[PDB]
Write an enzyme that holds these catalytic residues in place. Structure first.
Site, PDB file in Angstrom:
ATOM      1  N   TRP A  60       2.442  -3.459  -6.678  1.00 41.73           N
ATOM      2  CA  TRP A  60       1.742  -4.594  -7.253  1.00 41.73           C
ATOM      3  C   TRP A  60       1.162  -5.410  -6.099  1.00 41.73           C
ATOM      4  CZ3 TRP A  60       7.044  -3.889  -8.386  1.00 41.73           C
ATOM      5  CH2 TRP A  60       7.919  -4.613  -7.563  1.00 41.73           C
ATOM      6  N   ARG A 103       8.395  -3.742   1.390  1.00 41.86           N
ATOM      7  CA  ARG A 103       9.351  -2.650   1.479  1.00 41.86           C
ATOM      8  C   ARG A 103      10.748  -3.006   0.998  1.00 41.86           C
ATOM      9  NH1 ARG A 103       9.119  -0.715   7.430  1.00 41.86           N
ATOM     10  NH2 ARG A 103       7.888  -2.634   7.696  1.00 41.86           N
TER      11      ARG A 103
HETATM   12  C1  HEM Z   1       5.843  -3.038  -4.741  1.00 42.28           C
HETATM   13  C2  HEM Z   1       5.031  -3.973  -4.221  1.00 42.28           C
HETATM   14  C3  HEM Z   1       4.237  -3.806  -2.890  1.00 42.28           C
HETATM   15  C4  HEM Z   1       3.688  -4.822  -2.221  1.00 42.28           C
HETATM   16  C5  HEM Z   1       3.774  -6.311  -2.620  1.00 42.28           C
HETATM   17  C6  HEM Z   1       3.035  -4.301  -1.049  1.00 42.28           C
HETATM   18  C7  HEM Z   1       2.343  -5.040  -0.107  1.00 42.28           C
HETATM   19  C8  HEM Z   1       1.538  -4.454   0.831  1.00 42.28           C
HETATM   20  C9  HEM Z   1       0.444  -5.102   1.533  1.00 42.28           C
HETATM   21  C10 HEM Z   1       0.005  -6.557   1.303  1.00 42.28           C
HETATM   22  C11 HEM Z   1      -0.063  -4.211   2.383  1.00 42.28           C
HETATM   23  C12 HEM Z   1      -1.263  -4.407   3.320  1.00 42.28           C
HETATM   24  C13 HEM Z   1      -2.432  -3.857   2.510  1.00 42.28           C
HETATM   25  C14 HEM Z   1      -3.719  -4.074   3.249  1.00 42.28           C
HETATM   26  O1  HEM Z   1      -3.783  -5.051   4.027  1.00 42.28           O
HETATM   27  O2  HEM Z   1      -4.680  -3.284   3.043  1.00 42.28           O
HETATM   28  C15 HEM Z   1       0.670  -2.966   2.247  1.00 42.28           C
HETATM   29  C16 HEM Z   1       0.451  -1.811   2.956  1.00 42.28           C
HETATM   30  C17 HEM Z   1       1.060  -0.598   2.725  1.00 42.28           C
HETATM   31  N1  HEM Z   1       1.908  -0.261   1.680  1.00 42.28           N
HETATM   32 FE1  HEM Z   1       2.832  -1.612   0.519  1.00 42.28          FE
HETATM   33  N2  HEM Z   1       3.183  -2.930  -1.020  1.00 42.28           N
HETATM   34  C18 HEM Z   1       3.924  -2.587  -2.152  1.00 42.28           C
HETATM   35  C19 HEM Z   1       4.266  -1.307  -2.504  1.00 42.28           C
HETATM   36  C20 HEM Z   1       4.107  -0.147  -1.776  1.00 42.28           C
HETATM   37  C21 HEM Z   1       4.506   1.173  -2.210  1.00 42.28           C
HETATM   38  C22 HEM Z   1       5.159   1.450  -3.574  1.00 42.28           C
HETATM   39  C23 HEM Z   1       4.189   2.035  -1.224  1.00 42.28           C
HETATM   40  C24 HEM Z   1       4.380   3.566  -1.116  1.00 42.28           C
HETATM   41  C25 HEM Z   1       5.031   4.291  -2.047  1.00 42.28           C
HETATM   42  C26 HEM Z   1       3.570   1.271  -0.163  1.00 42.28           C
HETATM   43  C27 HEM Z   1       3.086   1.782   1.013  1.00 42.28           C
HETATM   44  C28 HEM Z   1       2.264   1.067   1.852  1.00 42.28           C
HETATM   45  C29 HEM Z   1       1.629   1.553   3.054  1.00 42.28           C
HETATM   46  C30 HEM Z   1       1.735   2.974   3.643  1.00 42.28           C
HETATM   47  C31 HEM Z   1       0.918   0.557   3.561  1.00 42.28           C
HETATM   48  C32 HEM Z   1       0.091   0.592   4.855  1.00 42.28           C
HETATM   49  C33 HEM Z   1      -1.262   1.234   4.665  1.00 42.28           C
HETATM   50  C34 HEM Z   1      -1.787   1.418   6.065  1.00 42.28           C
HETATM   51  O3  HEM Z   1      -0.998   1.817   6.975  1.00 42.28           O
HETATM   52  O4  HEM Z   1      -3.001   1.168   6.252  1.00 42.28           O
HETATM   53  N3  HEM Z   1       3.552  -0.048  -0.530  1.00 42.28           N
HETATM   54  N4  HEM Z   1       1.646  -3.154   1.297  1.00 42.28           N
HETATM   55  C1  LIG Z   2       1.052   0.309  -2.828  1.00 41.91           C
HETATM   56  C2  LIG Z   2       0.228  -0.879  -2.387  1.00 41.91           C
HETATM   57  C3  LIG Z   2       0.552  -2.170  -2.779  1.00 41.91           C
HETATM   58  C4  LIG Z   2      -0.239  -3.235  -2.352  1.00 41.91           C
HETATM   59  N1  LIG Z   2       0.052  -4.502  -2.728  1.00 41.91           N
HETATM   60  N2  LIG Z   2      -1.301  -3.003  -1.559  1.00 41.91           N
HETATM   61  C5  LIG Z   2      -1.607  -1.766  -1.138  1.00 41.91           C
HETATM   62  C6  LIG Z   2      -2.810  -1.501  -0.317  1.00 41.91           C
HETATM   63  C7  LIG Z   2      -2.803  -0.818   0.898  1.00 41.91           C
HETATM   64  C8  LIG Z   2      -4.017  -0.608   1.544  1.00 41.91           C
HETATM   65  C9  LIG Z   2      -4.076   0.119   2.872  1.00 41.91           C
HETATM   66  N3  LIG Z   2      -4.842   1.366   2.732  1.00 41.91           N
HETATM   67  C10 LIG Z   2      -4.669   2.277   3.876  1.00 41.91           C
HETATM   68  C11 LIG Z   2      -6.175   2.317   4.035  1.00 41.91           C
HETATM   69  F1  LIG Z   2      -6.626   1.939   5.217  1.00 41.91           F
HETATM   70  F2  LIG Z   2      -6.672   3.462   3.587  1.00 41.91           F
HETATM   71  C12 LIG Z   2      -6.287   1.224   2.996  1.00 41.91           C
HETATM   72  C13 LIG Z   2      -5.196  -1.075   0.970  1.00 41.91           C
HETATM   73  C14 LIG Z   2      -5.190  -1.747  -0.240  1.00 41.91           C
HETATM   74  F3  LIG Z   2      -6.313  -2.208  -0.827  1.00 41.91           F
HETATM   75  C15 LIG Z   2      -3.999  -1.950  -0.875  1.00 41.91           C
HETATM   76  F4  LIG Z   2      -4.026  -2.608  -2.046  1.00 41.91           F
HETATM   77  C16 LIG Z   2      -0.865  -0.679  -1.570  1.00 41.91           C
END
Ligand code: HEM
Ligand code: A1A0D
Ligand code: HEM
Ligand code: A1A0D
Ligand code: H4B
Ligand code: H4B
Ligand code: ZN
Lengths: 411, 419
Positions: free
Chosen positions: A281, A112
């Site tokens: 990414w 973030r």
């Molecule tokens: C720009 C580089 C970004 C990196 C390195 C990053 C990294 C991550 C990682 C490692 C996770 C956990 C994913 C998982 O374990 O499945 C995550 C979750 C998440 N990312 Fe980011 N992210 C990025 C960009 C973004 C962007 C651009 C958005 C929205 C516009 C976003 C929204 C979210 C949300 C909502 C989650 C949580 C999903 C959930 O609640 O299950 N991310 N991110």
């Molecule tokens: C923008 C972004 C960047 C990044 N690095 N990772 C993610 C990312 C997030 C999720 C979580 N999602 C909610 C769900 F439970 F539906 C699965 C799953 C992935 F596989 C991802 F790759 C997203």
């Protein structure tokens, strides 16, 4: 009126006032914590009014125009639309602000620090699945940017009566198919077997390989979803090789460069954007630890360990841990060698601590979900492990929503 | 109402009703989660100092009810007499004394209730040493020595707790000032660096201030600093032959022994409070055996602990100029292989994080099956390395505070008025 969080590694203490502005539930109660539970109807006129006001107030506060004539007239204009049409329409500025802040408020996102640098593609004029395909293709090409990835979100028309939703049926824009074999084995990604089956039932002719990019399954206006093949030149992939193990490329591993979540709901001011694919990414562990090494996913620890000639007869040799590291070295080296943006978990967690401390400084807090922020390997050697965090739900927010095939009324 | 937890690897769903018996706040609310806060709550079952009768008795009754329920009584003769006995004791001394059986039940159930402990599959196999007749720091030293010798058992480690006299008014507390029975000293160097265990720098300075002559090395077993009946604490050297130590070597890297690392075999927490039916045992050292990651990840590789990653990595000839080479991750694994190989080669009980987390999943299933739940703190249960390749990473957990329990307490040197 104040909550304190401490970093047990640095002794830094931050004071959270922002949590006073949370209004929606975490899932915990005063007597039981549900912090590790993964997942702990259209708003009526009276429900929508105060949600819209809160968001418009927050928007005008953010641009230092709170109480202004423009703030007041916007409020009146919004109340008029709600009163007349039972809904309202965000201005473009509000849409961009809301989408950036839903990212800013994503307590489970370690990336973030980038939240304010988000390219927002307004697709609210879209009416058909072909239109959604066009928007998504443009999203992919822009976000991928020949490997110099750029975060982006494409926002499709909001929910109206719940019977006309726009949905991307894919969980992510680019994922690989999974095929269950007659012998119980799985080809490709076992996470996507059910979705792969839906695609095939919809007429997709599958290559039946290990890394078939799935087709888009796009639903517009509550109609039945439609299949589209993403143009292969838009799907950037990285073959996975290892800087020291010559044999690693022989595993035939690859991954796609663009992580693009497409199954979540974006909530801004009470409006629900049920199709809002967003992309950033990768953090390398997402691929190297989860995608490749979860037992329910590609599950390559054994094959890699065999090739490393590790002793696999007992757990305490830590053969899994050893193979896991080498795999994640491979993922990072490969992306970097192909100049495809990626961030390792050390860099990413360090930046999130910097982001978090800045957020406490300028905003009064930063909601953060430790269970999700700490990487799935080497947790305590990243600084976030030692960082106390407060989890709370601010809006605009990204929300989970039911899988569309569990609720869609097939026409 | 009635809560489910899912394992996302196995899809096993467990249904929790035990949480309905939780007593103390977690710190969380419907609006804020504090699950990664070290000490989220100050909610205690009894107030400041010596409680009045309407404050202590309800907690006592509750524990006695719970104990007599556990053994298929409740309302029996002995239970009702026990309530009257406890009632009379509080009336006449403002406290009461646990029966031996109740003490044992209480200690095992504080362990069973420790949401942060991944070793609880062993909870009912716990040796309880009743030291409530202890009166002096010499007597405390004698009891702790016996505990250490019994628990160490020449490397076949055994779980043990020794329970010193409960708190009375708060002016007569028994305390082990050490955080753990066996820890290494930490010295602040003139050049600003730190020798030994930086976590123990302050406690080391207190010991040195109390007459301890430090050898000023990297692995100086600290003296015991024992406080009995509120008196000034007293230094004791644990006889070294009771302190089982393991030289850390590597099954492949012959140079690893040259790092000069050792660890002790007995992890023995001594700074926690044992709370049973409103009674507070402020000195209750308890010990089990190590999960390798406690030594190899946290003790050795935390930045503010021994912080050996750089030196191991240099010996391994890793690319250390960028984080993305994962050199820290590579060394971290070899260190933990070394720790396990060393303890196992010396036949000192240790458990790796894969086996430990696997046993905890089994414990959870057992607890839900017979007890209707198991409070578990995911943040602490998941190991500090290789989290997601362990089963607990994928296991949803419910965290709640059951009594009897182990609690944190202030470090006594912030409390103590000397004489
Ligand atoms: C720009 C580089 C970004 C990196 C390195 C990053 C990294 C991550 C990682 C490692 C996770 C956990 C994913 C998982 O374990 O499945 C995550 C979750 C998440 N990312 Fe980011 N992210 C990025 C960009 C973004 C962007 C651009 C958005 C929205 C516009 C976003 C929204 C979210 C949300 C909502 C989650 C949580 C999903 C959930 O609640 O299950 N991310 N991110
Ligand atoms: C923008 C972004 C960047 C990044 N690095 N990772 C993610 C990312 C997030 C999720 C979580 N999602 C909610 C769900 F439970 F539906 C699965 C799953 C992935 F596989 C991802 F790759 C997203
Ligand atoms: C028998 C082998 C045992 C193993 C393998 C084990 C494992 C662990 C581990 C790894 C932790 C986390 C430690 C940390 O990261 O600081 C822990 C915490 C804890 N253990 Fe166990 N343990 C064992 C025995 C016991 C016993 C015998 C007791 C008490 C009778 C106990 C009570 C606790 C408590 C209360 C905590 C939480 C400490 C806190 O909240 O700070 N454990 N255990
Ligand atoms: C009985 C037992 C077995 C085992 N394997 N580990 C432990 C153990 C527990 C802690 C918790 N401590 C209290 C605090 F919060 F201060 C940190 C710290 C250690 F160093 C330990 F070794 C205890
Ligand atoms: C049960 C537990 O909540 C679940 O396994 C979580 C753990 N933490 C996670 N953290 C991230 N980033 N992604 C995940 O999918 C999960 N899964
Ligand atoms: C901030 C965070 O709660 C703190 O670093 C915790 C995280 N999880 C832990 N887990 C264990 N087992 N032991 C610990 O000391 C900690 N520390
Ligand atoms: Zn919580």
């Amino acid at each position: 009126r104040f909550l304190k969080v401490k970093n047990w590694e640095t002794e830094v203490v931050l004071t959270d006032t922002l949590h006073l502005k949370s209004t929606l539930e975490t899932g915990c109660t005063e007597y039981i914590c549900m912090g590790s539970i993964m997942h702990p109807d259209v708003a009526t006129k009276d429900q929508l009014f105060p949600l819209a006001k809160e968001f418009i107030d927050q928007y005008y506060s953010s641009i230092k125009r709170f109480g202004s004539k423009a703030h007041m007239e916007r409020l009146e204009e919004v109340n008029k639309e709600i009163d007349t049409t039972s809904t309202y329409q965000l201005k473009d500025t509000e849409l961009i602000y809301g989408a950036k802040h839903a990212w800013r408020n994503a307590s489970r996102c370690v990336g973030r620090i980038q939240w304010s640098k988000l390219q927002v593609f307004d697709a609210r004029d879209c009416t058909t699945a072909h239109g959604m395909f066009n928007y998504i293709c443009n999203h992919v090409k822009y976000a991928t940017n020949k490997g110099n990835l750029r975060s982006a979100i494409t926002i499709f028309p909001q929910r109206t009566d719940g019977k006309h939703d726009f949905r991307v049926w894919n969980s992510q824009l680019i994922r690989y198919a999974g095929y269950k074999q007659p012998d119980g084995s799985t080809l490709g990604d076992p996470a996507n077997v059910q979705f792969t089956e839906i695609c095939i039932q919809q007429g997709w002719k599958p290559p039946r390989g290990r890394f078939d990019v799935l087709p888009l399954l796009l639903q517009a206006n509550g109609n039945d979803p439609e299949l589209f093949q993403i143009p292969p030149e838009l799907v950037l992939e990285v073959p996975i090789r290892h800087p020291k193990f010559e044999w690693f490329k022989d595993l035939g591993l690859k991954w796609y460069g663009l992580p693009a979540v497409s199954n979540m709901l974006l909530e801004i001011g009470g409006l629900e954007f049920s199709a809002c694919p967003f992309s950033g990414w990768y953090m390398g562990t997402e691929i190297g630890v989860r995608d490749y090494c979860d037992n329910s996913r590609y599950n390559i620890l054994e094959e890699v360990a065999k090739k490393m000639n590790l002793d696999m007869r007992k757990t305490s040799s830590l053969w899994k841990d050893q193979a896991l590291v080498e795999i994640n070295i491979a993922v990072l080296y490969s992306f970097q060698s192909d100049k495809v943006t990626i961030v390792d978990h050390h860099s990413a967690t360090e930046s999130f601590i910097k982001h978090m401390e800045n957020e406490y400084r300028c905003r009064g807090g930063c909601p953060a979900d430790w269970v999700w922020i700490v990487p799935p390997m080497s947790g305590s050697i990243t600084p976030v492990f030692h960082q106390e965090m407060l989890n709370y739900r601010l809006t605009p927010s990204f929300e989970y929503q039911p899988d569309p095939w569990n609720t869609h009324v097939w026409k």
